[PDB]
Design a protein around this ligand. Structure first.
Ligand SMILES: [Cu+2]
Ligand SMILES: [Cu+2]
Ligand code: NA
Ligand code: NA
Lengths: 620, 620
């Protein structure tokens, strides 16, 4: 009966039927985005109203629509025509991926460029790359993809080994026209293959790895009810899935004695951007919003047992809409398991003679997605001791270019003639906070050093300070690792037994934020990425740090627009947006396929509990 | 036959016999430190000379000696009387732990203080705490411990719940005198118990945890030969153990094709300090050098199977000397196992149709030690992809005090009337580098932001810069998280296939360094802890960042003295010393026993290999 249950195939089919009946889903219409909406605030009292949000594209050139449907009542709640030049283009459609290569294949400028390089058009793959917003006035209001070319020598070849540098094309994917072909000159196409399953490159496979078997002979310690409600070691939550955000966690709460205590109302990765740092005109426009432009959830992998996820795994198989509104299942798209996590607590006491050891565990909820060359794993962890953690795992194949003769300040060499432009992968976690309920505030906590003198004669004292963020205008914060800066979310109306407000402390990794010049297109479009932490007052339409329509959308929406409202956030329903990312100067070791690298953040209880919450964990 | 084998019981007994025969180990002598020395540089050509270093204390008040013995040849190599007032007191002896309480029990000032607080002397435990160097001239040249008191209500009671604040004593443990008793006034002794095995506090133990079974049905993938030589998934190393440093890794190398390539010659935690930040005179002198003053290795726990270490574990049982030179085995004191580590690399390629997934693993070498209230785990990890990582796990019981009425800027409240003074746990990892051999250099690498303008018209470019550290005077470096600062150790004479020097990149956690005022005693004694990274030219007598004798030893030795030599470190035999630590403002959740918290660092290959080193890892 949960209003947070996953969308069923039946609900998606019903949205399709409702849209059809209403005249909104004729033969030229395509669903670019479809997702369930969360229940409104205080709606637990009322009966269920399952609502779905839909972005509908029109392949005949007509304007797209944003539509909200009540699947419960069989009605269209709202439907509005979008002016994309103003508010943004809809997300890239999967069916458009192939169109760039297809159109370019009969374009005389493209063919001339390929001929200059002695490349067979039949062997030239073209990546369908988001366009962003630059100096090309004709693109405003048009659905444009840009194309970069890679040679594929045979069907099983890794085309990433063979970038065609000095060449880029721009394509209007609706009118099916090539708007521009830019050829700045030939570069050698790197010749070495990158086929990581070819025995010639791998050499003889290791025979040294003996098996590791992870089993749970009594099954797992968590239960799943209502399709997606998890209960595990005092934790309770609902595992949602959205085609844009991927796995979304709802109603994270911890059962402390008798009382179910909320911690986080909703946790998601609300955006992720991959800005490239190569000033070549062939690539200087490249910034991929995997979440906002491409919808990462939709490309979630089916995860194979004992391979992607090891141990006793329980899977969810989320259902999404295809381009026509038919349900499609992502089989085994979400892994859920618990795993051992080393020592939890240990003390061997001389005076009492008592030796004590307890083991830790974490609940793991994950998925893995692929967009082009990139593959990302998104992992949420809940620990016995109350810690909540997110980790992103980045792998795949590095996006390549030529490596310039005589080197580059903005590109790494991976193989002879083969380059990897510098880039970042930057995430925004949106944490709709509910520390013991919705009345929350955030404080920035810094370590405070003290001077040797009166009151500190030996010069050993140190302290800390906390600054409450009272209004949104003062809640745009940067990291300070040197001073141990963290942020505490607390509930000023809920005190622990020591009469202190209950709280959770956010620990960041303090990685560099967005490096681009502040006057760049990307600094405006990914404004969120320029600062480590933002706090907003909750609003049901403030979902993404980049706004609803990111594709070919200038600044104007998202977090900078939300915080201009300068709302009170001191003991209110608030949302924390944490920016965190990797800055990648590719190494030779990343080629021809990249070993996982990670980034993340965690939140630990900070006087939330009245003592350790893991005193009741048993021995052995 | 390895010259890096663990010390055997026979060798320790033989050192005892050699010392006895030489007149150096009569009945008033005690061994404060005994360890094997590493072979000298280029000594692989010559026959084995196993040498042992010994610090010998004399309980009758005579001066201690530093002695080097050749167990191979049955000789004393050198023996020198120490002037402790100058060079430092020997490490605290285990037999001295009990002496502080024992002496204080019949001291009329101590008894008067306890009587004022209505405390039974029979129930008052006294912690034997290192003294440091402050304003007390009479302590110079004397072995002093300071005593802080805790009430133990019954034999199995956790005395840490009941600190006796306002009271401290100083004791000369050789002459067996109480030098000073300071009573600044009564504080309430906190009354609540902290007995984490008492059902009244734990409540009913959870019955919800189902078993997790980790087995290896064909045994582990690593081999152990010569007692302590490990071979695992291309890695080779020797696992040493020293009573001061604990687990020491030697000869870390990676077999790349045919060639065994050195990476790190020796890795250890060469010091660890716990400075306290409470300006009360009762505690303002508290700084515990667990490694240098107490010798952490000697208190290594015996680790129980399926409990401290889970899975298919191979143990080492290192042998150490007792106070009289007899061998004593630390049974199951070192755990060795491999464990699964999630996804190593993954890509699902649209164009080629090939889907590829490989699992990661790490080799784990660990031990756990206990000193008083503190328990620390030291973990070294080697990963398939060439990454080397260290992690410290801090747990135990927090060191307590009274919590002052009306609060404190330097102390946390844990329970009614119960305080936890702020402190840090700061480690020094000494990495005797050997990237493809001994000719190494270090560069500091920062991200470089670029301005929008000519050559960067879209304001997207970013870069990096590397600064070679050429001499020791310029090799004292601080973190800069905001600019993504790392340090690369490379070999300028060994290039990869792309003609770039092979290297490894050190990634720090960028936690705060030593917070104490720069004019404090602790800032001078733990100078290493004030900066994140030091690089020295290798010398066989430069072992610890705090010098050989840390106990009651002022500034004058250690890293600041080593780098004054201003030696060339640009393509030379060099040593990196990385400071890293935790800054602990104790939380209510840390009481009555602390959940593990962690800190560490890692090194990743940076063009060391000619491509990914894990292409030959098999499927599933
Ligand atoms: Cu990357
Ligand atoms: Cu601590
Ligand atoms: Na909220
Ligand atoms: Na070295």
């Amino acid at each position: 009966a949960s209003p947070f249950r996953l969308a069923s195939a039946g609900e998606i089919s019903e949205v399709q039927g409702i849209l059809r009946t209403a005249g909104l889903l004729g033969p030229e219409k395509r669903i670019a985005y479809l997702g369930v909406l969360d229940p409104a605030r205080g709606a637990g009292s009322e009966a269920e109203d399952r609502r779905f949000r839909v972005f509908i594209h029109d392949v005949s050139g007509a304007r797209p629509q944003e539509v909200t449907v009540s699947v419960t009542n069989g009605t269209v709640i709202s439907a509005v025509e979008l002016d994309t030049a103003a508010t943004g283009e809809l997300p890239v459609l999967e069916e458009e991926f192939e169109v760039v290569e297809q159109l370019l294949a009969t374009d005389e400028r493209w063919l001339k460029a390929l001929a200059a390089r002695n490349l067979d058009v039949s062997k030239v793959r073209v990546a369908p790359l988001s366009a962003g917003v630059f100096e090309y006035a004709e693109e405003r209001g048009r659905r444009i993809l840009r194309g970069l070319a890679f040679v594929q020598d045979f069907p099983e070849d890794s085309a990433w080994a063979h970038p065609v540098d000095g060449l880029v094309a721009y394509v209007d994917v609706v009118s099916k026209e090539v708007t521009r072909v830019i050829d700045t000159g030939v570069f050698p196409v790197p010749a070495e293959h990158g086929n990581y399953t070819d025995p010639e490159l791998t050499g003889p496979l290791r025979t040294t790895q003996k098996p590791i078997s992870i089993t749970q002979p009594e099954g797992p310690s968590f239960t799943v009810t209502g399709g997606n409600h998890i209960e595990w070691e005092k934790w309770s939550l609902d595992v949602g899935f959205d085609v844009r955000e991927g796995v979304v966690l709802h109603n994270i709460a911890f059962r402390d004695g008798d009382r179910l205590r909320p911690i986080i109302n909703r946790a998601s990765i609300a955006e992720m951007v991959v800005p490239y740092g190569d000033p070549s005109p062939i690539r200087s426009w490249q910034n991929y919003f995997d979440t906002g432009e491409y919808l990462v959830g939709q490309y979630a992998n089916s995860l194979e047992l004992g391979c992607d996820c090891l141990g006793d795994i329980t899977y969810l198989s989320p259902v999404i809409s295809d381009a026509f509104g038919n349900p499609r299942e992502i089989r085994n798209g979400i892994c859920m398991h618990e795993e051992d996590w080393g020592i939890l607590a240990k003390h061997s006491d001389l005076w009492s003679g008592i030796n004590y050891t307890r083991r830790n565990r974490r609940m793991v909820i994950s998925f893995f997605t692929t967009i082009g060359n990139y593959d990302y794993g998104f992992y949420w962890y809940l620990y016995l001791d109350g810690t909540i953690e997110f980790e992103a795992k980045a792998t795949g194949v590095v996006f390549t270019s030529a490596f310039p003769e005589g080197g580059s300040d903005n590109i790494s060499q991976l193989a002879p003639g083969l380059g990897a432009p510098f880039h970042q992968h930057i995430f925004s976690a949106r944490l709709d906070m509910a520390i013991d309920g919705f009345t929350n505030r955030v404080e920035e906590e810094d370590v405070v050093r003290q001077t040797m003198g009166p009151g500190n004669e030996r010069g050993n004292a140190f302290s800390r300070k906390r600054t409450v963020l009272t209004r949104e205008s003062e809640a745009v914060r940067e990291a300070d690792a040197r001073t141990g800066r963290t942020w505490i979310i607390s509930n000023p109306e809920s005190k622990n037994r020591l009469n202190e407000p209950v709280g959770y402390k956010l620990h960041a990794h303090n990685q560099p934020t967005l490096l681009a010049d502040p006057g760049s297109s990307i600094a405006r479009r990914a404004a969120f990425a320029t600062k480590d932490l933002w706090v907003t007052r909750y609003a049901d339409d403030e979902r993404y740090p980049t706004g609803d329509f990111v594709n070919q959308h200038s600044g104007g929406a998202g977090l900078p627009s939300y915080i201009a409202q300068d709302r009170d956030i001191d003991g209110q329903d608030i949302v924390v947006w944490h920016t965190f990312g990797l800055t990648h100067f590719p190494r030779v070791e990343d080629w021809p396929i990249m070993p996982v690298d990670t980034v993340g953040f965690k939140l630990r209880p900070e006087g939330f509990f009245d003592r350790s919450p893991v005193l009741d964990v048993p021995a052995n």
